[model samples]
Target: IEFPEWFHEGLSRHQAENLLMGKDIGFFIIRASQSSPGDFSISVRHEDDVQHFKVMRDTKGNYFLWTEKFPSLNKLVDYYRTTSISKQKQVFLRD
Candidate 1:
């Protein structure tokens, strides 16, 4: 699968939406749709269910994944890779 191209380190809502349009990582699919000026939705789709992640940055301008704010696009990508590997490991080991 082709991973999304993140144009910049610090992501705005619009940038994220545009970059995530064709991103698919293994079993997960990332879909972005614009809602308003500051609001955007990230749909994390799996075969089981779809999780929508919504973020509006603070005055300092940062976004969180699962819980804490990751510093850059690479940080978020790392987190996703780590989490994905672990999940797939469990599933692959189950049999």
Candidate 2:
């Protein structure tokens, strides 16, 4: 299902409650910009490379990031989880 603008907006803003995709895994945008499309990333690198990720919607529209998938939801979770950790600090679901 296509996402409504409201869904994108809320997801982009890191407001999980506003997401419209009930079964969605939350929106992911480059740390450079949110509310668009492309990467399903969350977080931005900060001091000492410390980072923060946006709260994301889950399979049941729940809010989370790191453990959002847990393999049961998506087969790509393991890949995404590990890659995200080492790939981009701005693209992690660590929190």
Per-residue error for 88 in candidate 1, Å, reads: 15
**Each model's lDDT:** 0.42, 0.38
For 1-95, candidate 2 gives per-residue lDDT tens digits of 34333123334434432332222222233232354443344443332333335445556645445553443324343345445543334333222
Q: Against the hidden reference, what TM-scores do the models get?
A: 0.44, 0.23
Off by over 4 Å in 1: 1-33, 84-95
lDDT of the structure predicted as candidate 1: 0.42
What number of backbone clashes does candidate 2 have, counting pairs of residues 3 or more apart or in separate chains? 2
Give every collision pair in model 1.
none
Task: Please report how far candidate 2 places residue 95 from its true position, in Å.
Answer: 7.2
Local error of candidate 2 at residue 1 (angstroms) = 18
What's model 1's lDDT at 77?
48
How do the residues 26-54 of candidate 1 rate in per-residue lDDT, one tens digit apiece? 23323344454445444443334334455
